[PDB]
Structures are given as C-alpha cells and as structure tokens.
Design a protein around this motif. Structure first.
Motif, PDB file in Angstrom:
ATOM      1  N   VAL A 135      86.742  17.298 -68.012  1.00  0.00           N
ATOM      2  CA  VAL A 135      85.788  18.016 -67.168  1.00  0.00           C
ATOM      3  C   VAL A 135      86.162  19.472 -66.959  1.00  0.00           C
ATOM      4  CG1 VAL A 135      85.325  15.915 -65.879  1.00  0.00           C
ATOM      5  CG2 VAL A 135      87.001  17.543 -65.031  1.00  0.00           C
ATOM      6  N   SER A 136      85.171  20.351 -66.907  1.00  0.00           N
ATOM      7  CA  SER A 136      85.459  21.752 -66.625  1.00  0.00           C
ATOM      8  C   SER A 136      85.098  21.927 -65.146  1.00  0.00           C
ATOM      9  CB  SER A 136      84.647  22.702 -67.529  1.00  0.00           C
ATOM     10  OG  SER A 136      83.254  22.556 -67.361  1.00  0.00           O
ATOM     11  N   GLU A 137      85.942  22.646 -64.413  1.00  0.00           N
ATOM     12  CA  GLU A 137      85.726  22.842 -62.981  1.00  0.00           C
ATOM     13  C   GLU A 137      86.111  24.242 -62.518  1.00  0.00           C
ATOM     14  OE1 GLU A 137      84.558  21.581 -60.054  1.00  0.00           O
ATOM     15  OE2 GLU A 137      86.241  20.749 -58.909  1.00  0.00           O
ATOM     16  N   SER A 138      85.472  24.697 -61.446  1.00  0.00           N
ATOM     17  CA  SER A 138      85.778  26.017 -60.904  1.00  0.00           C
ATOM     18  C   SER A 138      87.171  25.961 -60.276  1.00  0.00           C
ATOM     19  CB  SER A 138      84.740  26.405 -59.853  1.00  0.00           C
ATOM     20  OG  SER A 138      84.743  25.463 -58.798  1.00  0.00           O
ATOM     21  N   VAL A 139      87.974  26.990 -60.522  1.00  0.00           N
ATOM     22  CA  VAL A 139      89.340  27.045 -59.996  1.00  0.00           C
ATOM     23  C   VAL A 139      89.743  28.454 -59.516  1.00  0.00           C
ATOM     24  CG1 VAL A 139      90.154  25.165 -61.465  1.00  0.00           C
ATOM     25  CG2 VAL A 139      90.162  27.496 -62.327  1.00  0.00           C
ATOM     26  N   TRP A 140      90.804  28.519 -58.715  1.00  0.00           N
ATOM     27  CA  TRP A 140      91.338  29.795 -58.242  1.00  0.00           C
ATOM     28  C   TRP A 140      92.510  30.101 -59.194  1.00  0.00           C
ATOM     29  CZ3 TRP A 140      88.088  32.089 -55.481  1.00  0.00           C
ATOM     30  CH2 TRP A 140      87.490  31.558 -54.320  1.00  0.00           C
ATOM     31  N   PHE A 141      92.634  31.345 -59.642  1.00  0.00           N
ATOM     32  CA  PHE A 141      93.736  31.669 -60.530  1.00  0.00           C
ATOM     33  C   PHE A 141      95.015  32.012 -59.778  1.00  0.00           C
ATOM     34  CE2 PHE A 141      90.486  33.196 -63.877  1.00  0.00           C
ATOM     35  CZ  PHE A 141      90.278  31.874 -64.263  1.00  0.00           C
ATOM     36  N   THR A 142      94.888  32.291 -58.487  1.00  0.00           N
ATOM     37  CA  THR A 142      96.031  32.667 -57.670  1.00  0.00           C
ATOM     38  C   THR A 142      95.980  32.051 -56.276  1.00  0.00           C
ATOM     39  OG1 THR A 142      94.882  34.666 -56.933  1.00  0.00           O
ATOM     40  CG2 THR A 142      96.257  34.845 -58.886  1.00  0.00           C
ATOM     41  N   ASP A 143      97.033  32.272 -55.499  1.00  0.00           N
ATOM     42  CA  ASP A 143      97.097  31.735 -54.146  1.00  0.00           C
ATOM     43  C   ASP A 143      96.482  32.703 -53.146  1.00  0.00           C
ATOM     44  OD1 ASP A 143      98.599  29.178 -54.507  1.00  0.00           O
ATOM     45  OD2 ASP A 143     100.261  30.497 -55.091  1.00  0.00           O
ATOM     46  N   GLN A 144      96.056  33.866 -53.627  1.00  0.00           N
ATOM     47  CA  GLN A 144      95.472  34.890 -52.761  1.00  0.00           C
ATOM     48  C   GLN A 144      94.253  35.546 -53.403  1.00  0.00           C
ATOM     49  OE1 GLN A 144      97.671  35.603 -49.653  1.00  0.00           O
ATOM     50  NE2 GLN A 144      98.279  33.610 -50.535  1.00  0.00           N
ATOM     51  N   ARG A 145      93.120  35.550 -52.705  1.00  0.00           N
ATOM     52  CA  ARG A 145      91.919  36.183 -53.250  1.00  0.00           C
ATOM     53  C   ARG A 145      91.265  37.025 -52.167  1.00  0.00           C
ATOM     54  NH1 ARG A 145      92.199  30.763 -51.415  1.00  0.00           N
ATOM     55  NH2 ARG A 145      93.570  29.784 -52.990  1.00  0.00           N
ATOM     56  N   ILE A 160      86.561  24.146 -54.563  1.00  0.00           N
ATOM     57  CA  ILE A 160      87.236  24.989 -55.533  1.00  0.00           C
ATOM     58  C   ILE A 160      88.688  25.012 -55.073  1.00  0.00           C
ATOM     59  CG2 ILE A 160      86.797  27.013 -54.161  1.00  0.00           C
ATOM     60  CD1 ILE A 160      86.793  28.581 -56.892  1.00  0.00           C
ATOM     61  N   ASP A 161      89.619  24.967 -56.012  1.00  0.00           N
ATOM     62  CA  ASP A 161      91.020  24.959 -55.642  1.00  0.00           C
ATOM     63  C   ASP A 161      91.858  25.500 -56.809  1.00  0.00           C
ATOM     64  OD1 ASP A 161      93.448  24.361 -54.332  1.00  0.00           O
ATOM     65  OD2 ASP A 161      92.619  22.506 -53.518  1.00  0.00           O
ATOM     66  N   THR A 162      93.154  25.695 -56.561  1.00  0.00           N
ATOM     67  CA  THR A 162      94.085  26.209 -57.560  1.00  0.00           C
ATOM     68  C   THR A 162      94.343  25.193 -58.666  1.00  0.00           C
ATOM     69  OG1 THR A 162      96.101  25.340 -56.529  1.00  0.00           O
ATOM     70  CG2 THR A 162      95.244  27.455 -55.720  1.00  0.00           C
ATOM     71  N   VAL A 163      94.781  25.676 -59.825  1.00  0.00           N
ATOM     72  CA  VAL A 163      95.060  24.781 -60.937  1.00  0.00           C
ATOM     73  C   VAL A 163      96.113  23.732 -60.589  1.00  0.00           C
ATOM     74  CG1 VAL A 163      96.047  24.612 -63.232  1.00  0.00           C
ATOM     75  CG2 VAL A 163      94.298  26.321 -62.752  1.00  0.00           C
ATOM     76  N   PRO A 164      97.171  24.119 -59.856  1.00  0.00           N
ATOM     77  CA  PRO A 164      98.241  23.195 -59.461  1.00  0.00           C
ATOM     78  C   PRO A 164      97.730  22.059 -58.575  1.00  0.00           C
ATOM     79  CG  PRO A 164      99.051  25.394 -59.376  1.00  0.00           C
ATOM     80  CD  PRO A 164      97.545  25.497 -59.508  1.00  0.00           C
ATOM     81  N   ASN A 165      96.844  22.373 -57.632  1.00  0.00           N
ATOM     82  CA  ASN A 165      96.298  21.332 -56.764  1.00  0.00           C
ATOM     83  C   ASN A 165      95.403  20.412 -57.574  1.00  0.00           C
ATOM     84  OD1 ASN A 165      97.482  22.147 -54.294  1.00  0.00           O
ATOM     85  ND2 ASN A 165      95.901  23.719 -54.014  1.00  0.00           N
ATOM     86  N   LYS A 166      94.575  20.995 -58.435  1.00  0.00           N
ATOM     87  CA  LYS A 166      93.691  20.188 -59.256  1.00  0.00           C
ATOM     88  C   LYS A 166      94.517  19.189 -60.062  1.00  0.00           C
ATOM     89  CE  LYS A 166      89.563  22.079 -58.425  1.00  0.00           C
ATOM     90  NZ  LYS A 166      88.588  21.234 -57.675  1.00  0.00           N
ATOM     91  N   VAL A 167      95.581  19.673 -60.694  1.00  0.00           N
ATOM     92  CA  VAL A 167      96.444  18.834 -61.518  1.00  0.00           C
ATOM     93  C   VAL A 167      97.091  17.655 -60.774  1.00  0.00           C
ATOM     94  CG1 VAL A 167      98.497  18.824 -63.001  1.00  0.00           C
ATOM     95  CG2 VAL A 167      96.906  20.719 -63.107  1.00  0.00           C
TER      96      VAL A 167
END
Ligand SMILES: Nc1ncnc2c1ncn2[C@@H]1O[C@H](CSCC[C@H](N)C(=O)O)[C@@H](O)[C@H]1O
Length: 245
Positions: A135-145, A160-167
């Motif tokens: 699945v493709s999903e919206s993610v944050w590339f950093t911990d700060q935006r 929407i969440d960070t790649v690490p949380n998604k994983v």
C-alpha cells in the motif's frame, strides 16, 4: 457529486507512476497463475492494469465509485484482460473475500479511507499466511514540519505519520515489513498534479456555472501549492508487508 466525473478524465486519482508500481511489485515473490490478487480503492484501475500486465493470476479491483468501476472494466476490455481482471463496486471496510484466501492485497493512495492501522488489521484476515500487502500512504519525512502543512494534513487525514511509526505498526499488526520506499516527487507533480491541468479547462467549461466544479478546482490548486512548498516534509511511502505466523 461530480468529483468523480473530473477524475474520470485522468490517468489516476492519486500520486503514483508505472515505475513505482513495478518497483513495489519487484518485492513480491509468491505470485503464480493461481494467485488471487485484490486491489483496494483501485479508482480507474490504472495501476491495476500495469500490475495485471506484469504478474500472473486473477485480480479483483474494488472501488466505492461506480463510475470508476465502469471505466475499469471498459479499459480492461480494450486490453483483453477482462478475463483475469474484473472491476467490482464495493468498500474496503465491508469486504466479502473468503478468509485467508488472497496472495496479494494492493492499494495505492486509498488506505486512508479506512485508516492505516485499521486496514493492516482487517485486511490481514483475507490473506494467505505468507501473503503480501502493498500500500502507498501519506507520510511525514521528518519529526518536525511547519504549521501550515501540518494543520492542512490534520484537516484531511489525521493518521499521516512518520515512516518509523508506520513501520512499527506494520510489525505490530502481525506482518514483516519486507520493503519500504518513499515515492519520487515526479509521482505528485508529473503523474498527478500536471495531468490535472488539462482536465480542468475541459471540465470547468463543460460544467460552466457548477458551484461544485469552481471549488473542486480550488481544492486541487491549493493542494498543488502546499506540495510545491512543503514537498520536503511529506509525500507517499510504499509498504510491502508479508503476513506472519
Ligand atoms: N470505502 C471505500 N472503499 C473502496 N474504495 C474507496 C472507498 N473510499 C474511497 N475509495 C476510493 O479510493 C480511491 C482513492 S484515489 C486512488 C485511486 C487509485 N488507487 C490510484 O492510485 O490511482 C478512489 O478510487 C476512491 O473512490
């Protein structure tokens, strides 16, 4: 509700591209001519056709909008895949697939309708152990935006969440996070926002005066702007998960 009509005049309703769909496919090594595949929230079935042309087995696309399923089968027809690729009007939160009967569950930019974790949880029950979920999903590339982009995303998709949380969620849901890659910017600009250009001039005039249209164009134009300004903090990530045990 002509939001559908507009997207019917487009290759796809969400970020993506052939290379990306194929690159993700490159990680699934269990497919044969007896594989049962499902693509959830297939829209017009653009990625579904690219997929069907590179893997064996029968695929079943599922989408909420009948308009997309109609274009899905018509397109399947021109391509002759109609035998092994059928479009079906359904919902991701109310599936009828036999338990643990699928080898592959695909979904590009559509899992947000039901929720990331929820999907990982529920769809799991329709997969053969060792089966895959991509699945493709919206993610944050950093911990700060910045705040602009952040609140914009808290108004559309709160998950929407960070790649690490998604994983970790994928691991938690009982899968093995087999592959995870962020999508190239040309998946938004080139393959998504741009095609949306021509579509508009023709749509807008065909429906001159339609209040819904005048605004749909405004939503799209606002998203494109946020992307061109905050593309460094967010995007789409593709996740290939293999059911455990
Ligand atoms: N509850 C639901 N069940 C199934 N599909 C849904 C749904 N809610 C929305 N959708 C569909 O999810 C898709 C999101 S847009 C992405 C379309 C396609 N996957 C692509 O990548 O081009 C749309 O087709 C939308 O109609």
């Amino acid at each position: 509700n002509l939001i559908c009509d507009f997207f019917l005049n487009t290759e796809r309703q969400g970020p993506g591209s052939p290379e990306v769909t194929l690159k993700a496919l490159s990680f699934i090594d269990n497919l044969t001519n007896k594989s049962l595949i499902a693509d959830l929230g297939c829209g017009t079935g653009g990625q579904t056709m690219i997929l069907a042309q590179h893997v064996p087995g029968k695929i079943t696309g599922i989408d909420f909008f009948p308009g997309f399923i109609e274009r899905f089968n018509k397109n399947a027809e021109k391509l002759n895949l109609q035998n092994r690729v059928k479009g079906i009007v359904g919902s991701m939160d109310d599936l009828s697939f036999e338990k643990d009967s699928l080898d592959l569950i695909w979904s590009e930019g559509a899992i947000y309708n039901i929720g990331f974790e929820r999907g990982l949880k529920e769809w799991r029950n329709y997969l053969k152990p060792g089966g895959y979920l991509a699945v493709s999903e919206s993610v944050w590339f950093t911990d700060q935006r910045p705040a602009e982009i952040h609140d914009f995303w808290m108004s559309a998709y709160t998950e929407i969440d960070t790649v690490p949380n998604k994983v970790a969620q994928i691991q938690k849901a009982g899968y093995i996070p087999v592959a995870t890659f962020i999508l190239p910017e040309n998946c938004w600009i080139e393959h998504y926002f741009a095609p949306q250009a021509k579509a508009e001039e023709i749509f807008r005039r065909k429906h001159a005066g339609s209040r819904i249209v005048e605004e749909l164009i405004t939503s799209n134009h606002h998203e494109a702007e946020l992307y061109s300004k905050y593309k460094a903090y967010y995007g789409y990530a593709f996740f290939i998960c293999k059911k455990g045990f």
